[PDB]
Symmetry: C3
Subunit: 436 residues, 3 copies
């Protein structure tokens, strides 16, 4: 009886499962690795740290490889609960990676916002907001240290660790640009908060110290790294209307084998606002009360999952004038594309089309070479922004092809592309194999 | 000092870890794959789409392989907040997969509900409810597009992609059956909502386009796929009592190497109701107020994690009259079996017994061949449904072997089995290797 | 058009991705394993089960290997909602694993609490609280069965399953120690609850039944298992102050290659209290009301994510008098170290420093050999516990280096270390390869 009687229940169908076993689940032989050690070492910041300033850092040569890089900020909030929305993330307006004077990659705060909405999830996502925002209903004058982790190719997997020991003739530098106005920190809407303190910044880099043999190999052999890059040519001007369904054809200007496309429609006035403001809880300032105004967001709750507040009705991509795929609704790129390829949840207003089976995986799993496409176009169709945004009965009970009239402020269309490239390192210098 | 001093801290115990390294963590060599392309293409639906109708789809031969399949619905809700519970999931009452006139697999909406409770988790689970339900407190007349993803063997992993190019003489068809009455959409309890609109449906299939060489291999060589199937012989009649602890012996009728058994006790009146209704928040209509009634659920909050509202007291499986394992409580199959083999959280009323180490993994990891077992029996023992369901003090403060008196409505016992089978494809035709 | 036109978009950059494919994503060849069967079998408990008693279990020789071990408790709560905090976890005060009279590992309830805060996440974490606590607002007299899963080396992965068949001359035993006082079960603060019932306990072990060939191999060949151990030498006395920033140097006493260090500052009066109590919602009894008292916690909500209530200001580790790394804030070890190496969220008051790239992975990925370090020291600096804990305006709006004055009760410093060791099994006996 018990488990022993199940072993005897053996048939001809068990041949495909346990005939001539190849593996066993009860004796794992673990692999031996190269000895190493990790150390986070602070960097020297060049320039005056402050709102709207540009500072830079030259990675000091302390170890052999570098992996994680974290930017620490110390901020004091100037409003009460729910008056900030990822202020430390917005403060890092853009960051540029440079090797030997050559730009390797460059990221922007809106990419950080888009990456978080698509590729982070669950408790990891909430821990990221602890690191970049106040999440415990803090009041005016609350001071907190923030940690903004960079997400370049060598920051996301140790298998792509940048070998400083193999770059003795090339300097690795980071160029930071700080935001000028950060909601709930030094500005409240358009009005500056008097006495707002300037931020304090520090850059920390995680170094890998290698053993003698592997140290000789990294310094003497040629290296080829399959890296990822971000492409972003600037915001596009979206033209959603309140009386009809407007349409647009945005000529894409991407290159290289691309893993996926990600885009959003943002109101440039408010950071991370990808949906329309409405008089429903969490969608505007003072929603549900007599102080409600659809002009100002509920800053702490800027994001939403309500598709009714998104602006995109349908979309398709055209490749040299012909449809790459049939037109799908905006909710398809927000719900189904992430469901099929990511496995998390994406707030409304952020859209994805993946050419890869696993876009969040470092291992390539399907790409499209935009360098061989003369004309790639994103054909868009917007909803009719005809719903009264101040009426909860109108917002919570309408049809599929309409949205709130406040959606006309979503005029900044940001389109991102993640591509692959090859970083060759030899003779103490590194350079990208493909420039377009 | 720092990391370099840790490298010198090297001893005899490091032999098992870093002696003669076999791998390294700082130089991943990514694998090269076969070139391909993906495209979601809409299908033609045969039949009249409507409540209680049967429609079918013949997969058009656009590409070489097919992977994901999504069913789109457009529904208009007829109630206010919390009056629907996965209506798009319930609308897809059953779906049958057919190759060359032969049924490969067939799923049911209650399986979709059971699969979601056991094998989805975290934000992925919440995104699935966005795709199949209203989750933003929408009101009467709210229209929304829903996406129901199918979970057949070729829908869950690209490694089992169905080769249409290798099936030139066999037709692949899907047979859908739409539910007649959907709570909060066209019915409110037992009463039909006047003017309810019929649903609109579309079927979308993701095709894989292969390169020349791999296209020749799929069309010329014989293929063998290790696939998974669902077994379900219909609901069993549970007989829980309010005066004593009833017991039952359900003769199982499964075959093939089975990964796991999953079952629930459902009140057939309400979709997804696996637990008893009670006058505690979320467990009945208007709970905690003067309008409370334990006759009607809080439809939007039909599920629960409260074990006190589950009906099963203990259970064991018998194999040819002898115990396959010792009797365990119902909470063991709801909490511990999922904890040990899945790693999520399962609402009360859904139970699991796994023969596999990783039941959610495609790779077989332990099965039981039910084709070699003459008598397999699920021995059940129910709690005494003696608690007053209208008393919060009685429901929130009782013992282990009792439940609410409303648990006597959980009379539909659905037992599911997930088994493996082999799909052989050769000479343009496909067929299963094992029929029993 | 469509997907076929993307295949033709092929360039010279595709050489690194799809030239001479090595793998394919659309034809997975699954591996065949050794036939086995699993069965959970109840053990005999030696001794009188009760609060503050020591009981033991000798693993009966029913199967060939053992994997999961679960301890079942049945408890009756003596308070209302929010008056318990993981009572079943605290009840298992310590558990010791013994093979042939030799201790292999020993765990404590505070380690269970620390492990849960660091290495569990998402729905898995919530399911663990369902198994060890009341989570549905149960009232006085509510009875519930609890399941405490052990987390020894053979409990966390089947690849380290303990071979009882290879230990015919060595006895495997578990030594349990039950807590004396459990909040909300038999005590309310310092006052005993009259009529509190003694707990009932049962131990269940999952056995693996192997096929004939693999059974002969396990019983005849020598085995070497790379296992993990917990190190804990007892609580350290922390000395945080309310008038200045105190500092300490705790001489660590660890050995063997260590994966990570984890520590917390606990008020020994309250289980799992790692942060200061304050008059903000969830941080003290009756917070926000006229019955608020910062002397008693909100037991059901003892944990918090508010860094302002943590006590540690900065920390660094010294190796033979020299800095292993530069000083970082306490929030770095609570937010960034888990973000970089775990990927979940860790409540405030629990800190981590990882020597491994993946500390939660069984496969070694970086260690530090503490057996070769003469002096390892944890240098600590505490915040100034000068904030009025009864003032929400003072707690929700202060600076980085201060905390509530109630933080002076966090006087128990628990430092944990997870190391590797080798378990050799030969001639029917097992023994560890390294003792220090
Ligand atoms: C995003 O979503 C989150 C999750 O839903 C929201 O948090 C929830 O808010 C609702 C709560 O029931 C729930 O507990 C909470 O989780 C979040 O809401 C915003 O942030 C929260 C923290 C609230 O802000 C706090 O609100 C109270 C303020 O305190 C003052 O309150 C007065 C009533 C007192 O008279 C005064 O003395 C202050 O309180 C004292 O100090 C506080 C800190 C102590 O807690 C309190 O003792 C209990 C007193 O100590 C003696 C805080 O300054 C502020 O940080 C939301 O505020 C809404 O909900 C409150 C429960 C309510 O009291 C608020 O009304 C006050 O403020 C509004 C204007 O905001 C005034 O018109 C009103 O007269 C009153 O003064 C208010 O309804 C926050 O939400 C508001 O502000 C947002 C800013 O972007 C946004 O505009 C939003 O729509 C607003 O609702 C969400 O952002
Ligand atoms: C599942 O769990 C969820 C999470 O807990 C629940 O959501 C929460 O509900 C409690 C809220 O505090 C919390 O914010 C929310 O997240 C969910 O509850 C059900 O769905 C929610 C959305 C509520 O439904 C909304 O309730 C308000 C209704 O509006 C009417 O309210 C009247 C009081 C007004 O007079 C009338 O004008 C309407 O409001 C106006 O329109 C709305 C849309 C605007 O928001 C409002 O402005 C603020 C007004 O605009 C001018 C909505 O139609 C409805 O969708 C739950 O309803 C309960 O909680 C409400 C806060 C409360 O107001 C409700 O009372 C009303 O309805 C009950 C009957 O339902 C009447 O007896 C009462 O007189 C009053 O009219 C109610 O207590 C939903 O829960 C209820 O219905 C469920 C149906 O299955 C179920 O029966 C449940 O037990 C009920 O409680 C959970 O389903
Ligand atoms: C679900 O859970 C909720 C808690 O989370 C419950 O609410 C709690 O109920 C207990 C209260 O102590 C607590 O405050 C409350 O939160 C809920 O219980 C049911 O609903 C509550 C609100 C009670 O209903 C009220 O009961 C009184 C009725 O009024 C009549 O009372 C008579 C004594 C008078 O003689 C008669 O004139 C009526 O009063 C008049 O009209 C009302 C509307 C006015 O408010 C009142 O003036 C103040 C009078 O005006 C002249 C109300 O209509 C009704 O809403 C529960 O009722 C139980 O508890 C009451 C305290 C008690 O009085 C009730 O006895 C009455 O009703 C029973 C029949 O139920 C009669 O046989 C009896 O003669 C008497 O008339 C009763 O013990 C409700 O619970 C009952 O009904 C449930 C189904 O609806 C269920 O069947 C339950 O087991 C019953 O106990 C929970 O449902
Ligand atoms: C941890 O975080 C959780 C998530 O926030 C908290 O749960 C939330 O609490 C706030 C709710 O709005 C929310 O719905 C809930 O999720 C949790 O809070 C603690 O646990 C919860 C479940 C509450 O305990 C319940 O509180 C109600 C008690 O019932 C009695 O209430 C009286 C008002 C009635 O007069 C009496 O008849 C009782 O109710 C009856 O029986 C109950 C079970 C029925 O539900 C009710 O019908 C609706 C009646 O049936 C006829 C329960 O015994 C108790 O388990 C929190 O309690 C706070 O919030 C309640 C909403 C409020 O009513 C409570 O006030 C009562 O108790 C306080 C003292 O606790 C008294 O001073 C007051 O006079 C009143 O009697 C209370 O404000 C729990 O929180 C409290 O206790 C904790 C113990 O550690 C802790 O001390 C905390 O700070 C306290 O707030 C969090 O622990
Ligand atoms: C989508 O957005 C649009 C634009 O914001 C919105 O239209 C606005 O509605 C308010 C009205 O003052 C504006 O002129 C109009 O632009 C639309 O609301 C829904 O459709 C509109 C056209 C109205 O419907 C018309 O109502 C009158 C009725 O005779 C006619 O048959 C119908 O087409 C909205 O009705 C609301 O506003 C009316 C002015 C008011 O008279 C209605 O009350 C009647 O009906 C309600 C139930 O719907 C009864 O309870 C009440 O006793 C009375 O008979 C009503 O308040 C309509 O909104 C309503 O219906 C939709 C579903 O179609 C949703 O449930 C809304 O939540 C609900 O308010 C938005 O759908
Ligand atoms: C489980 O479900 C059953 C069936 O629903 C339920 O039993 C019902 O209780 C209500 C009663 O009217 C019904 O006849 C009965 O079927 C049971 O409730 C708990 O057990 C029952 C038997 C009652 O206990 C008996 O109470 C009277 C007491 O003299 C005797 O020693 C005891 O065995 C429930 O007590 C509640 O209902 C009584 C009618 C009432 O008198 C009680 O009040 C007394 O006790 C409370 C504290 O318990 C005091 O605050 C109060 O001043 C007075 O002294 C009480 O309301 C009993 O419920 C109570 O106790 C359990 C734990 O045993 C839980 O805490 C409940 O939440 C609590 O109400 C359910 O457990
Ligand atoms: C951190 O913790 C410490 C110790 O708990 C706390 O200091 C306590 O504050 C209360 C006071 O009674 C105690 O003596 C003191 O130990 C500190 O609070 C913040 O700093 C202290 C020093 C006070 O600031 C001083 O306030 C008076 C002002 O003239 C002077 O310039 C300033 O340095 C706290 O101010 C609060 O308490 C005062 C007694 C009261 O007068 C203040 O009211 C004035 O200011 C508020 C706005 O801040 C106006 O709305 C009001 O009309 C009046 O002008 C105030 O209540 C100070 O707390 C306040 O400011 C901080 C940011 O610096 C946070 O926003 C607080 O939430 C807010 O209350 C803690 O930061
Ligand atoms: C959207 O619909 C709202 C309700 O009718 C309008 O208030 C809003 O108008 C805008 O904001 C108001 C307050 C005014 O400033 C208008 O000039 C402005 O156009 C609509 O956008
Ligand atoms: C469960 O216990 C409840 C409280 O005593 C009963 O109301 C309920 O009875 C059912 O529902 C009521 C409203 C009536 O319709 C009865 O005929 C029915 O049996 C119990 O099931
Ligand atoms: Hg393309
Ligand atoms: Hg079996
Ligand atoms: Hg060390």
């Amino acid at each position: 009886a018990g488990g022993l009687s199940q072993l005897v229940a053996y048939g001809a169908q068990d041949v495909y499962l346990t005939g001539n076993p190849q593996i066993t689940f009860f004796k794992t032989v673990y692999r031996r690795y190269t000895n190493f050690a990790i150390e986070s070492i602070q960097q020297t910041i060049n320039g005056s740290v402050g709102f709207g300033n540009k500072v830079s850092t030259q990675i000091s040569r302390n170890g052999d490889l570098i992996t994680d890089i974290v930017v620490e900020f110390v901020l004091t909030k100037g409003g009460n609960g729910g008056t900030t929305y990822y202020p430390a993330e917005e403060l890092l307006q853009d960051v540029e990676l440079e090797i030997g004077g050559q730009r390797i990659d460059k990221h922007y705060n809106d990419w950080f916002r888009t990456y978080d909405a698509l590729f982070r999830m669950n408790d990891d996502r909430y821990n990221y907001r602890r690191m970049t925002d106040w999440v415990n209903n803090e009041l005016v004058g609350a001071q907190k240290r923030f940690y903004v982790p960079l997400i370049f190719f060598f920051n996301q997997t140790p298998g792509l660790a940048l070998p400083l020991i193999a770059l003795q003739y090339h300097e690795v530098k980071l160029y930071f640009t700080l935001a000028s106005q950060v909601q709930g920190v030094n500005y409240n809407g358009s009005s500056a908060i008097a006495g707002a303190a300037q931020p304090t910044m520090s850059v920390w880099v995680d170094y890998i110290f290698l053993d003698t043999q592997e140290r000789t190999r990294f310094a003497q052999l040629p290296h080829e790294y399959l890296i990822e890059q971000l492409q972003f040519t600037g915001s596009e001007t979206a033209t959603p209307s309140a009386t009809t369904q407007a349409s647009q054809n945005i000529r894409l200007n991407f290159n290289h084998p691309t893993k996926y496309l990600a885009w959003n429609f943002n109101n440039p006035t408010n950071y991370g606002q990808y949906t329309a403001l409405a008089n429903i809880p969490g969608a505007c300032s003072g929603a549900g009360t007599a102080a409600a105004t659809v002009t100002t967001p509920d800053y702490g709750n800027t994001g939403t999952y309500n598709e009714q507040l998104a602006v995109l009705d349908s979309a398709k991509i055209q490749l040299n004038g012909q449809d790459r795929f049939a037109t799908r609704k905006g909710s398809y790129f927000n719900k189904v594309q992430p469901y099929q390829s990511i496995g998390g949840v994406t707030p409304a207003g952020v859209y994805l089309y993946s050419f890869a089976l696993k876009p969040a995986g470092r291992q390539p799993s399907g790409t499209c070479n935009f360098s061989r496409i003369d004309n790639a176009t994103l054909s868009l169709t917007y909803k009719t922004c005809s719903i009264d945004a101040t009426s909860p009965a109108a917002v919570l009970g309408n049809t599929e092809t309409v949205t709130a009239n406040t959606a006309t402020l979503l005029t900044a269309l940001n389109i991102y592309a993640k591509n692959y490239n090859v970083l060759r390192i030899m003779s103490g210098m590194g350079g990208l194999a493909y420039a377009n």
